[PDB]
Structure formats: C-alpha cells, structure tokens
Amino acid sequence: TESDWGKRCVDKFDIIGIIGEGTYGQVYKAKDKDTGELVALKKVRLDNEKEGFPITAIREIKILRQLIHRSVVNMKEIVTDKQDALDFKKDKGAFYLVFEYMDHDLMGLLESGLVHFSEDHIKSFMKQLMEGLEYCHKKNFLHRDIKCSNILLNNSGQIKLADFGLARLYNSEESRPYTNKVITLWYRPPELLLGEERYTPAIDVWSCGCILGELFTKKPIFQANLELAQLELISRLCGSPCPAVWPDVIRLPYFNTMKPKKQYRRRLREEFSFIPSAALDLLDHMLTLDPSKRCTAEQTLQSDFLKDVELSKMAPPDLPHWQDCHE
Amino acid sequence: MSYNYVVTAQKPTAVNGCVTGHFTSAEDLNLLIAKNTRLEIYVVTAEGLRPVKEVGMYGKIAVMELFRPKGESKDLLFILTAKYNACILEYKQSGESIDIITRAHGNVQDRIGRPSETGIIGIIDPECRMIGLRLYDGLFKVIPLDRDNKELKAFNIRLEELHVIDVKFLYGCQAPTICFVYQDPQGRHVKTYEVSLREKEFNKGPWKQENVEAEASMVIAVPEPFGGAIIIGQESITYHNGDKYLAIAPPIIKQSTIVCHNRVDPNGSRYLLGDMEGRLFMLLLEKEEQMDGTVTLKDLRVELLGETSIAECLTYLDNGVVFVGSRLGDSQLVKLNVDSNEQGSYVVAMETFTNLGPIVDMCVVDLERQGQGQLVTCSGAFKEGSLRIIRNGQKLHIRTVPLYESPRKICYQEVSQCFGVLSSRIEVQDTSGGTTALRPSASTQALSSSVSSSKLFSSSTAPHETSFGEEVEVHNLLIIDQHTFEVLHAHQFLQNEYALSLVSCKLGKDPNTYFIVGTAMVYPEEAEPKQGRIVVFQYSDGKLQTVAEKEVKGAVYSMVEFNGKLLASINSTVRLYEWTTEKELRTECNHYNNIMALYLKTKGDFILVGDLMRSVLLLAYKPMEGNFEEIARDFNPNWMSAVEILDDDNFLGAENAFNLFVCQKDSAATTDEERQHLQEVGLFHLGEFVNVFCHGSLVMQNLGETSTPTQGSVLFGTVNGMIGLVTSLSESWYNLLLDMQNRLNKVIKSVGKIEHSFWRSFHTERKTEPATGFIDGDLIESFLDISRPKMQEVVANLQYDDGSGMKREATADDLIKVVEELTRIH
Amino acid sequence: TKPCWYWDKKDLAHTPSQLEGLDPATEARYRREGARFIFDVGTRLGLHYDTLATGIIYFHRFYMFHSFKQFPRYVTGACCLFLAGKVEETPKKCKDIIKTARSLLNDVQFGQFGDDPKEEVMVLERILLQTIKFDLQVEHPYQFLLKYAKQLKGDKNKIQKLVQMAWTFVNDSLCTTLSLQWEPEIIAVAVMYLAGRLCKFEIQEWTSKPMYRRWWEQFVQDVPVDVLEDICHQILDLYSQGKQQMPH
C-alpha cells in the first residue's frame, strides 16, 4: 500500500542533480519514473553509526507525517538504496526522504536580486507563511529555524515551510528546558540571545517579522556575526531590553552580562516609515521584545494587513526570465 | 585557497556624467568629466579642452556636482560613490604640484532602507545651504552645508511619496524648495516642498501639485529671471510656476525618448535636449515683459539642431561648443552654428573621443601572424555600433569599424579569412504593414545578402498584433573581411528571431568549417522563449549557404565546440550534439539541473555552466558512458554575467553586482559531499560589469620576453569600455604582493579618504565581505608613481618568504624592478 | 496514507514465531520478557513513561513481522528503546543502554548481544525502521486516561484512586498484545472501567451526563462492552497467572 514506507527503491527516480547541501545528507532533484512528478530527495546516511539514524531526520519524519497544510512541505515517501542484503549488518545504504519539488527558495530569489515584492505580493506570502505557522503552533510544534533558506516558493505563488529538523513539541503548562542556540543569528529572537532556555512559540513569530521587513527592503534587517552585536542592532531599532518593556528580562541568564551600548529608544516606526501603515503595525507587534507581549500567529492573520487578503488571488512575485539575460 | 592578480589594460572610456564650472581657479572655466571610478579635469580654451588633472577614486562616481558656498573664492566639488561614500573636494595647485584636497567626508548609508528604482539622485541648493540626497524610497536625506560638518552628518525627512522619478532644488524661493515628479496609482504628479534645517522636516511647498504626463522623466529648475520648473516627457514639455502653466507637444519629440538636458543661457532662455536616436534639440523660452517691469514666460518652442552621439550627458561650455558625453558611443565636441549647412544641420563635429562603449563580446585573433594578438570587440549600441580592433604599440592603437547597428557576438573563422558577427537593427512598424529602418546599417549595406526561409515555425496560428510606430529588432549574421572589415554578406534571421550565440568550428568527420548560430523565437507575450533554432551555415565563395537546421524548444543562449561535438545550452538544458555523416545534428546527452544555462565554457571533457541565479556548475562528459556528470556546484546564490575556466581546478565568475569570484574544488576528497562543493576562494569587487571573458594577451610574446611571475592570461570586456586582465600567482608571490598592498594603503592618500579595503570588499545589497585571493594590480602598479620617501617607507621591514631565502629583506629598487615587470603583462 | 497497526486476536495464531514452531504460551512469555526488559532498562536510565511505552509498541509490532527464533528479543528490545528515545526526544547513547542491559541480564541472556553488543543493536535500527514502516508517532493510553479523568468531577480522592489503579493496569497491559488489538483510547476506557468495578465506583455520576449509564460513550464512540470486558479479562489474566494480585 501507499503507507509501507522504507521498502520502495530509489531506482524509481531519475536523479536530475544536486540542489543543496543538507544537514544529514545531500538534497537531490529527481523525477518519478512512473508518474513524471518532480521531487526533492533528502538523503539520510546512517553509516555514521555513532547515533544511527539522525535525530534531525527523525524529527522531520515524525512531524511532517502529522502536519497537513497547504503552507507546510509534504513528505511523499521514504525510499532506499539498492540493498545487497547478504546480511542486515552488511547493508549500509542510505535512506531518501521524498518531498514535493519546489521551484525556488526565498534566499535564492532575494540573494540573486531577481525578485521584486509588491505590497500585494507580500500579503500573499505572509498570509500563507503565518497560516502555516498557525497550523503548526496550534498543533503545539515549534519550528525553531525559520530563515529565508527554509521558505520555499513555487511560481504559482504558493509558499511552503520546509526545514523541520529542529522542531519540537511545546507544553504550555509544564515548561521544558530546550537548546538556547536554536535560530540563525540573523533571524534569532532577542529572548534567546539573552539565554532563554524555556522559550515560547513567539521565537518563530520574531523570525517571520524579520522576513516581513526584509521583503520590504530586500536586505535582512539584523545582520551580525556575534550574539552581542545582534542584540545591539536589534536594540538600536526595537529598543533596549529594559524591565519597563520586558518585566521578566531580569530573570534571563545573560541580561546583566550582555548589555547594549546604551539604553535605546524604539525607532521601528521611524526607520520603517516607508512601509504601509497596515504592515508597519504588523512589524512593530511581531518585533516586540517581550515574547509575552509579542503577537501570536493568529493575531497576525487577524490584522488589517492580512485579514482581508484572499488566497484565491495568489499574485506570484515578479521574476524576470527574459531581458534578465541582456541588460 | 587560490591566488590571482587583476589589472586594468584600458581604463573606463564611457562618460557617466559631465559638469562645467570654476573648480581649478575662480577664473578658468572647467569641464569635469566622470568615467566609472575616474575623474577628468579639463580647462576650456578657444580650440578645445586643455587637460590638467586626472584622479581615480575608490568607488563608482554616482553624484558629481560643483557648488560655491559664500566665503569660497572658487567652486567646490561634491562626489557620492555608489557605496554611499560622500566627500567634498578642493583643487589646490602649488606651482607645478597639483593635488586634490578632501575637505569633508563620510559614509551616508542607512542601516534600513529600500534602494530607489530611479537610482541615487543628488542635488544642491542654489544658496548652497544643503545637499539633497534621494537614496531610499520614502526618505529624503539632507546634508546641511555648515562649516563645521566636516563628517557630512545628515538626517532623514519622511517623504510620503514613495516612488519619486526626479527632483531638483528650485530657484527664486523664500526657503530651500524641492520640486519632484512622483508616481502613485493615479498617475504621475509634480509636487513641491520647502526644506527646514531648523525644524528638520518639510513644510508646505509654494505651488500646488499638477497632474503630469504618464512618462514624465526629467525636472529642470529654471533660473530666477523666469523661475519655476520645466518637466520633460515622451510627448510633451510643460512649465509650472505658481499659477502659470504652459505645454508644448511638438510631434518631433514623440519619435525618440529625450534623456539629457543642459542650460545654454544662464538667464534660462535656452536649453539643450538630447534623445536616444542622437538628435539634439534647442528648447527656447520666449519672454514677454509686462509694463509692470516683470518678465513672464510667454511660450515654449522646440527646434531641431542636428545629430550627435547618443549622449548620456550634455554640457554647453561656451562659444557654441558643446560637450557630448556618450555611454553607448564616442563622446564629442561639436559646434553649434547660427547658420545651417546645406543639409539643414546646425551641428558640425569638431573632435571625437574614443569610447569602447558597451563591449558585448570580443575575441583575440593574431591577424598579422605576428605572434602578438589583437582584440576585436563588439562595441557600442544602435547607431553607435562598431567593431574596434585593439593592439598594443606606450599606448593602445584602436581602429574603429562603424556598423550603425547593435553588434551582439563575434567569432573568427580563419579558413575564410573573415569574422562572423551577429547584429540587430531597429525597424519601426510602418503604414505598409511591414517595417522601415531608421537608417542604413551593416546588415543592409552588405555586398551580397540572404534571408532565412525556414519553415520550422511557419505553422504559427499564434497571433501577434502590430501597432504603427512600435519598434522591432531585426537580427543578422554578418560576414566581415579580416583585412578590409568590409561587410561581405549579411544573413537576416526570421521575423522575431533573435540571434543569441555564434561559433565557428569543424564538427565530426566533416572537413568543412561552419558558422553555427543559436537563436530564440521572442514574442512579447512570452516570459521565456519556447522555440528556437540551431543553424549551420557555410560561408563559401562569397555566399552563405544554409547547411542544416535543428529545432529546439527554447533559447540557445550559449554554444561551444566540444571535441568535435556541439555543446549548446537551451533554457535550463545543457545539450551535447553529434554531427552525423548526413550533415545533421544528433543529440547525444542532456543535463537539466539548471534554472537558465546562460553561459558555457569547456576544457577537455569538463564544462563550466553559468546560471542566471545558481552561480557556476562544473559538469563533465563521461565518454565511456555517453552522458554528463555533475562534478561540483557553487551553492552560493549569484547572478552571473560571464564565466571563465582558469585551470582544471579554478573557475572565474562575474556577478551582476560588479563583483568577481573564483571557485575551486575542495579537493579534500574525504567525502563525496565535499567534492561536490565548489568553495568560493576568491572574492573581489571589480566595479565594472563584465560581459565577456576571453583567454589571450595583447603583449608581444615572441621568443625573448623575460619570465613573468604571473601565469595565465584572461582578458575581459565591460559595459563602460574598461578592459581588464586576470592572471594567477604562486602562494609566495601573492603574500608578497598582498603584504605590500597593506603597506601601500597606509602610505597612499585616497581621494575622498575612501579606505581601499572597503572599496574592494565584495558587495551586494545583502552582503559585504572583505576581498580575498585577489591582488589589486592597479594598486601595486601605483608604487612606481609614489614619491621616493614613500617608496622606502613602503619597503621598510619588508621580508620576502618561501623563496631562495626564507627571510629576505626588500629594498625599494628591488620592488621597482618587480612592479615594472608586472606592468609588462599588458 | 497511514498504515493499519491493529490485528484480531485470532490473527495472533499466525505470527512468524508461531509458524516456526513456537507455541502460543512461549511467544506470550517472550513478549512479556522483552517488554519488561524494555521497561526495566529504560526505568533505570530515568526515561519518561511515554518513551518506555513507545519502545514497547515498536517491539510488539516488530514481532508481528519477524520470528523470535531469528531475532533475539533482548537485542530487539534494546534497539526499540534506543529508537524510542530519539523519537520521543528523551535520547540515550547506545553504549548506555547496553551498559544497563548488561547490569540487568545474566550471562546467558546477554549472550544474545553476541561479541559486539552495540553493533548488534545499531545494525538492527534499519530493519526496525523499515519494519514499523517509518510510522514513528504513537499515542498511548496514558494521555487519554488523564484527558478523560480531568472531565470527571466529584470526590478528589475516589477519582485519584481510580486513576492510579487504572494507570497500573496500563503499565501491565504493555506486557500483552492489547497494544496490537485496540486503539489506546479504548485501552484507557477499559482500564477506567476495570478500576471502577474493582473499587465499586459508578463513574457515570462523575460525568456531565450522570444518567448516561454507559459513561464511556461520551469519551470513545462506538465501543461495546464486549470489547471493554475482553480487555479487562486479558488484563486480570496476567494477575491470576502470576503470583501478583489486583493493586486496590
């Protein structure tokens, strides 16, 4: 049946080529020989055999067979290398996680400078991204690695969230200790920079706000190399962590250790004055320092900016594919 | 890691801006001409220009303006670079010693902002109270020009109008006032605001907004006798001042877009206007004085003067002599006469300044069997299109072959003693239903001619409607004699067929040498071409014969000969064709993992593929199997402009951001994943747009030249005419030259106090990285021009390593020898 | 889409183990021993109750597809616990599971791990994953015992006694093939039902429908008493066979 994963062979796919270096293996583009469908294959190597099958991949399998949303990436099956099978011990072939192929990734589209986002385009992008995050958050999962590289876009204008390798379940009642260095510094929440080991789903909201601003500037908002420098850059724009705006900031491991140069005022509305009013309010609420005062995903979907966006009009982003060749 | 060296063989030749003023002395009339990264200072004489000084800046010159604040005897110069380095400069001369003073400087970049569509705009107040900068959508930056602002500190005023087309400071206003055309969903409008340094905000401007032409392009601030502003569009010119409103819409200007303006008469009575078909107009302001004693603008008139080069900038100088600064063709001095000549023209050319123009392609060929090498370039555009033959002999000798249409690709075919050149010319839909060319050109003045009769796409049934007056491109293959550069033949391709790629080669067991062209069927409706041809021609006995055609489902962006097979890239696909004994192309194998395979290069059985957004890929032919294999890909996202193979392991690429990079196979080889990773080992901000990489050199390499430390030779052509050279170094030589750069940067004084390390840092809107693996040869070659005290300072404590001596002290005369050798590679 | 992980009791007469000549009593014994091994090993390592149960469910499912004569049970158990730890985010290093398994197993039993215990376990992970068809997410009776008990209102102490007694019945049912016969929701109800009979409690009084005598129908739709009674019978059988008695 369709459900007996792990037995079908990778012979069933014509490999087209390598599209990226993953975490637990390389990622290939391939075409199904039977249906002609295009797929992405994440290769999982258990030959490391220090901890066997990678937990990163286990998370992605465990979670993505539960999550069904148009804005969440779909795992179609798990297939295997041709096994000599003289003995199960001799077998060292790898496993492949079969996903739907997506035309582009957001980082590629922005880094190549080949995309222009209108307001109406940003609405479609953000409505889908927040709706998918809402589905995950309402199902009590945290992504914990939201970056432009992990938001995939096909030319239909459909957005899908993708790298669930760092995803874990969140218990609101019983707080659990997690890993504090979870998101890439550019998209990391301020709470985790100050060492919050018991973090909330608000970490993902922060990342998406960073993307919201970036789509309006085409440059990442907070680009730094070290955790302190980011806190300064965030503080310069969002305001310095003070107990006035973040009453429990005093309870964070590195609050006294890590301080911005000054006590900064919030200038988000000034430095982002070129953003539409409806969007600026979304950014100010999403990039709120205190995770407990930071808006939820649902609250973003019930905003003047995204509430009345209709996803029937997907409004794909503008990609030049001719006259880009010659100026 | 990899070590490479990059030098300039020909400096940028395109004029990017020109101003006139009193910069060198309060007495002389100066002409300041800006080429990319280069500033040229001239003094106006009765015969022409007297050059006085040229400086380089560590930045692309984006804004250039002269101002004279109260208290200064002479004009000061403001320059802003494309990386947002701002400075105020002064000319100072002590007898024979000429130097440029940096009076104020700083970087005005904002942490947050969206770069505007119409680019950086910089303007200065008529009272020189402030400098206005339009860098980002929705923001206006003010650098107030107070004596104390030596760091050029500035503040931003929120600007409600996000999409600004153009802005100028107006004359005759009680406060500093800006006039700007902007675009919102309701069309384009002209609006005015007053700028308050005291309040650091806008106040309501003097005259109300008016709705203007949908394609309103340029704003002119008219001098105080009239006051107000003139707005130039595609069809109309309008003057707005207070309640006064005029509009002239003469049919002559609708024919070609007007791109430049300049004031002839300081009272504002007369202006020059230029258009993209090269026409030069006079815009006349007709005065009417009232009995009150006030003078009002009565009417506007436009008069055609003649023809110049397609000009980016105009400057009137004086005595009827105008400077035509070109980016697409040669620049000029032209004289405007009061009386027309017998042809009806008031314009007569005086001098012609060479511009290698846009270099769309080029090849190196030893025409005279002199073992030297000559560079034949596809240069210029539209009526300025030309071939340029460049040889060394101390200056470069450049011959110009006018084509009067756009050259696209060039390739040399020795067997036929001629060149093949792809070209396109503009025709316009005319009342016959066909099209008519605006002027004769190479593809119409060929000795013999032919037209494709291919039936491949003739089925059609796809409607493409035509409106009178619309432009079309008509593409041709030109056969051009290598000694006379006469156009021997011209082959016109199908209607709406673009010629994109050209090779000259033998295939298979076929002894004939063919010209092969790859094309694309371009319809306005299509996002990406879905039809195309590979055409095999034979040039024989003065006629071009069509040997074979292969239909493809896309655009043949790039082709290259591959061990007797034809390697072609069709959209995402990279294909290898064999040439059968039946003289037809047969597909052997394909590689599909691309977004758009724009560029191809080969070495042996290895192929380097340049993609629109996915950087460069190393593909390989496996002859035992008859297919392709992916050796390694650069996973850093980059928008490629050109690529080249340096050696079996190092690969050179050019970015659309004016950056260079070198990739190398990791070659660790522990795991397959590392091998499939091309590591970016070289990063370098060139500052030019590279269209073509080409292996070769123009230096006389006949037996007897002393061995150079540099190994290899890649020449490259750019949009601004700049020609450069990339070569490799040994680890020892790099470290020496790199250590010497760091010493030279401490010693050499930069114009605008721009840090050299900043200038060459890899730069996109999203990233900035320090340069690596690249020696700025132009810096190294400046050691020979610095004063002796500075030379010994540079060589102090300089220890050579990894050589005959592990530690070797360096003297200045030793480096004078090394740098002089490094100047002999070009 | 998703696989079916439930069989009918009658089907257990045809496991690979049975068809290789193992009798029903022996396979049942092997299942108890393997499960209790998993339980004991993970408890020594401090593992959450869900992690123990997940391993046990993997283990029970595994021997619906393979024979106990070809896959030594304690190796399989150790492998299942190792994977369960990664699935449930309570990871343990394989060397630590082996160390604990050696502490708890005698010399004969630890013979199953062969000359290289860690290798025998790590190698099996591939077969385990393919066997359980990469369906890693598992629900257990515990979460439903609590979800349903929370909706009971009445004597705090009588309900807590019901929960603890039922919880013990859940732990005990992991030694049986009930995990393979009935969804966890049904197990949770069955154990509540059993505890109610044993403690002489009438659970309907604690529900929002106190005159709805089939109190479980508002928690689990379509469950006949036939099922709950069958489950109760199977749980108490473990107590009667052993020397142990009902907790009460």
Ligand SMILES: CC[C@H](CO)Nc1nc(NCc2ccc(-c3ccccc3)cc2)c2ncn(C(C)C)c2n1
């Ligand atoms: C977090 C997942 C990362 C992000 O990059 N990878 C990723 N990207 C995709 N497409 C975008 C794309 C990238 C490169 C190319 C490309 C094309 C030609 C040459 C080289 C690269 C094409 C598409 C994917 N669709 C499906 N999945 C599954 C495996 C999650 C993808 N994973």
